[PDB]
Write a protein that binds this ligand. Structure first.
Ligand SMILES: CCCCCCCCCC(=O)O
Ligand SMILES: CCCCCCCCCC(=O)O
Lengths: 256, 257
């Protein structure tokens, strides 16, 4: 009688738009809380780390519908949104708040129709539809801010881009210190000003790739483990359970 | 049955702003030069900035107005051009023209008709978003995007217009425009000849457009209008308006109200 699940330590690596087709989910980012009811839209700003508690309505269907944007697209939308609207200058990368990174609204019939006939194959049509949707929302300022913030490239993003070219290699701080011509102290203090370290980034990348590949339903567990750079399958199951809080079979069964 | 003539022919109309028109209740034939484009009952029409046309019009209901119109100023047109270039990608020769590439009718859907309905021209940005949404929904819309870019650049005739509009009732000559622009008279008329116009035509079109617009405000006498556009007498003004457009100011006002 488990139509509920708790998941820990999820990263949003792409600006994400979510629609609750059938679930109710509470979100604990750090030490706050935002709950999302049945029929709503959610805007998730790129680079937040959050934990979730979900309850489904119907078991024979999946909990939600998701739209994600890559970097080219995100930049385009930022550009055209700059042209159509104004330009703000809270450009100081200082104070954050969870309530400026997560947002929910109540979906209408007219928004729902356009949401229906969205097919993420025609790129320009997709950009048009998102701008149309944003225009119909009240207090949309908070969204445009979050779309600009997530368009700038930090040093951690360069480290990530470097790592993604060979995920099954065995990286160390010394090797990263070679590609960027600097010292280990320089690189570790640079990543320390953004409140992270090298092991954290490597772990988040590998567990993101694994969670995504599990849902394709076209590779054994050993194939996934060899793809992300891990010796044995049983070791991989231990680490997945310790990071996310559930087993790969439970994850797959819930989200199908 | 003479008072029941609710059909009309108008001559020498000049489009000074990119225009989107919706045939709420009439039927319309458009003779630009020596071609013809007809527009049926329930359709959308796209008119490219700077074309000169003549029109024949027949109403469906007599006690109501003929159509609904949207016009865009320069700032707004430029913004739409910019964001449009962003979304669809950058891609002029300025060679072959065609009246079939400057005036285009389409068939509007019911949901598009709704989006057009809930248009209130108070939120400026919202209008740009709705218009981009509409354009994306159109099949074979490439021919449209071209006409919005073509009419977004500033030509030499636009410099002449901007100079003259700062004092409409003054008495200009080709000599004065030849001094302000550091050049010769032959230079100026050969430059304007390459855009297919001359200076007297531009002056006359400007004065007749401002007048036709003021007539519909319904709050200025004829002598007031004539003084405002730079013309001596009211009777002279009526003569010129009738010769240019093909109808009398009473006929124009009575029809379009
Ligand atoms: C099952 C929830 C979907 C996301 C799971 C974690 C994947 C990282 C998201 C991303 O790459 O932007
Ligand atoms: C019913 C309109 C009669 C024609 C008047 C000419 C005005 C065109 C200038 C403009 O586009 O603003």
């Amino acid at each position: 009688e488990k139509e509920t699940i708790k998941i820990n330590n999820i990263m949003i690596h792409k600006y994400t738009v979510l629609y609750t087709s059938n679930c109710i989910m509470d979100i604990y980012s750090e030490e706050e809380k935002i709950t999302c009811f049945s029929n709503r839209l959610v805007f998730l700003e790129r680079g937040v780390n959050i934990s979730v508690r979900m309850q489904k309505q119907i078991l024979s269907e999946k909990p939600y519908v998701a739209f994600r944007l890559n970097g080219d697209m995100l930049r385009h939308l930022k550009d055209a949104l700059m042209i159509i609207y104004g330009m703000s200058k809270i450009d100081t990368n200082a104070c954050r708040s969870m309530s400026r990174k997560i947002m929910t609204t109540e979906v209408n019939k007219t928004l729902l129709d356009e949401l229906k006939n969205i097919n993420s194959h025609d790129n320009s049509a997709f950009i048009s539809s998102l701008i149309y949707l944003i225009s119909k929302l009240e207090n949309n300022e908070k969204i445009i801010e979050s779309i600009y913030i997530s368009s700038v490239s930090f040093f951690s993003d360069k480290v990530r881009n470097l790592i993604e070219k060979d995920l099954s290699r065995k990286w160390t701080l010394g090797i990263i210190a070679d590609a960027f011509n600097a010292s280990e102290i320089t690189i570790r203090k640079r990543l320390e000003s953004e409140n992270t370290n090298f092991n954290q980034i490597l772990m988040q990348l590998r567990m993101s790739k694994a969670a995504l590949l599990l849902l394709e339903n076209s590779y054994q567990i050993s194939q996934i483990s060899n793809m992300i750079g891990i010796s044995s399958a049983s070791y991989f199951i231990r680490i997945f359970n310790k990071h996310y809080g559930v087993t790969p079979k439970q994850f797959f069964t819930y989200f199908k």
